[model samples]
Target: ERAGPVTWVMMIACVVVFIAMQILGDQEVMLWLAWPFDPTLKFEFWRYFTHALMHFSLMHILFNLLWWWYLGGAVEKRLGSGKLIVITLISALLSGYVQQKFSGPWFGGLSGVVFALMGYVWLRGERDPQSGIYLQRGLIIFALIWIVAGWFDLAHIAGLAVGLAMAFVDSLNA
Candidate 1:
C-alpha cells in the first residue's frame, strides 16, 4: 500500500530529525527553535512545531515511522488526511510541549502522535463495546499502565491522554 503526501512529509521529518541528532550528537542542534529561551524567534510557528519532526536516533525514526506507517494510516484512512494532519499536528504540539517541559527533549519523534492514535482507537472501541476494532483486554490494561506511568515522566503519556480526550470529546458528537 502507498502512503499519502502527509505520510511522506512525516517520514521526511523523521529523517530530518534523525540526521540532525546524528550530526549534533543529540537533539541540541534543534535548539535553533528554542521558544522557551527566546519567544520572538521561532515562536508562534516553529517552536512548538519543529520539534515534532526531529528524532534522537536512527532507531527512534525507524520505530516512529513504523507506527506512523501502520496506525497513522489507519486513522488517516478513516478520519481523512486533513483531520489526521490537524490531529497529528495538534497532538504533537501539546504532547511535545508537555514532554519537553517534563521529560521530552526539544527533539523527539512521532511516537507520541502514533500512541495518541492508539489511545483514541482503544478509547472509542471500549465505548462501543463491540465495534470490531478488535482491541484486546491486555492492550487496554497495558495502555492504562502506560498512561499512569506517564504521570511520572513518560513522554508518550501526553499522546495517550490527548488522543483519549479527543476521542471522548468526539464521542459526545455521536
Candidate 2:
C-alpha cells in the first residue's frame, strides 16, 4: 500500500541538500540551515530543525537517510503521515537544541530525529502492540550499544528520550 509521503519527502530533502552541499559547498548551506553559528547572522527559527537537511558528508547523509527511511517509513505506515510529520518536526527542533546546547551548532544530520522515531516505535509497540509498531528487541539493544559507543552522537539521545515520552503519551491516548 502507498504510505509514507513525509518519509519520502524527508529522505529526498536530505539527498537534494547533500547534492547541493557537494556542488555549492556544505558551508553555505550549513550557514543558512544549521543552528545559528553566530547571533549576528540574523535569526530564523527554522535554523533549529532545517539543520536536519544539512549533511556534512556522503556517509553522514547516507547512514542517516537509511535509518530514517526504514523506521520513519514504518511510523508513517502505522500512524499516518501527519503523525510522522509532527514527530519529525518536533524531534528536529528538540534534538538540534540539545546537541547545540552542549556541543555548539557545528553538527548537522537526521540521526537525532531518527533515534526519536526509533524510540517512539519501540516504546509504543511495547505499550500497545496493537499500534502496529513493535521493534525487535535485538535491534533495540544494538542501537543502545551504538549510543554508548558513539557517545559523541549526543543529539540522538535527546531524540530517543523525546520518542519515549511521546510513546507514553500515545499509549495513554489510545
Candidate 3:
C-alpha cells in the first residue's frame, strides 16, 4: 500500500551496486560510477546519474536507502513514474554537478536525491493535497539536523531548488 514497483527497482539497483562495490572495492566501482572530474571535458553522461549509486560506507548506504525507499516509494505510488523520473534525473545531474564544482568529483551519495524527494513530497503536498504525497514534519526536522551535521552541502541546495521549482511549475498547469 505504501510503495510501488519503480521505487523497488531503484532501491534494488542501489543495493546491487552497494554489494558490487563491497566485493570489487570502492575505486573499482567508482572508476565508472563516480562523477568524472570536469565532465565538460569527457562528457561521461552516464556518470551524472550513476554517481548517486556510489556510497562510501555502510551507514551511508543504509541511511540513503531508507529515505529513498520511503520517500521514493511514496512519490512513485502517488505521483506516478513520470514526475518521479523527472525529479530524479534533473536533481541527480544538478546535484552531482554542483557537488563536483563545490568539492570534487570524488564524492558520491544519494543525499541529493533524498533531499530532492523531501522537497517534492513536502511541497507538492502543500500545493496539491489531492495528490496524496506529503513529507511528515518530523522528517524535515531530521533532514535539517542531518544536513547541518553533514556540514555545508551545495548539492542539496541544487536539489532543493529543482524539486521546489518543479512542484511549482506543475501547479501552474491548473
Candidate 4:
C-alpha cells in the first residue's frame, strides 16, 4: 500500500479499461475516445483523458503501465496523491493535445503520462536530492532511446514534451 492511492487506482483502472478496449475492439472504442486535431468540432471533452486508456498492443500497455507504476507510484508515495493527480491529468492533456496537433488523432497510451513522470522524477531528483527521487543513468538513456525509436509514431513522440512538463512542475517548487 506504500504505493499510494493514485498509483493503485490508476493501475487498476488502466488494466480494467485495457481489457474493456480489447473486448469492445479498438475501432469501436476509438470512435468515442480518440480526439482529432479539431476537437472543437466534436467537443468530446472526455477524449482528452480517455485517450490514455487505449493501447495498441500488449507490449505498449505493458511498457506504459510498468513505468507508470514505477515512477508514478514513487511520486505518489513521496509527493502525495494531489501531485500525482495533477501531473497525470495535466501531462495527459498537454501530451495528447501536442501529439494530436503534430500527428493527428491516431494515437493513445499511458506513455505520455509515463514520460511526464519520468521527466518529473529526473528533474526532481537532480534539483532536489532531498526529495528522494532518482533515476539510474542507464535507465534514462534507455528511455531516451525508446523515445527516439518512437519517432515513427508521431503520437508517441509526445514523450519529448516530458522535458517541458517536468521543468514546469519543478519550477512550482521554487
Q: Write the per-residue lDDT of candidate 2 for residues 142-162, one digit (tens) a residue.
A: 779879978754487899999
lDDT of 4 at 8: 86
- What Cα-based lDDT does every candidate model obtain? 0.69, 0.86, 0.84, 0.78
Sorted by lDDT (best first), the order is 2, 3, 4, 1
**Per-residue lDDT over 34-146 for candidate 1, one digit per residue giving the tens place of the 0 to 100 score:** 33445455445766766667766667678678867766765665556786787698788888778777754444567678778778777767775443433467766766776
Greater-lDDT candidate between 2 and 3: 2
By summed lDDT, which 10 consecutive residues of candidate 2 come out lowest? 148-157
Best-first order by TM-score: 2, 3, 4, 1
Model 4 spans > 4 angstroms off: 36-42, 152-174
Better of 3 and 4 by TM-score: 3
Q: What CA RMSD would candidate 2 show?
A: 1.9
**The best candidate in terms of TM-score:** 2
The RMSD (Cα, Å) of candidate 4 is 2.5
Pull out the clashing pairs in model 4: none
Regions of model 3 farther than 4 Å from truth: 38-41, 152-154
Query: Residue 155 CA error for candidate 3 (Å)?
Result: 1.5
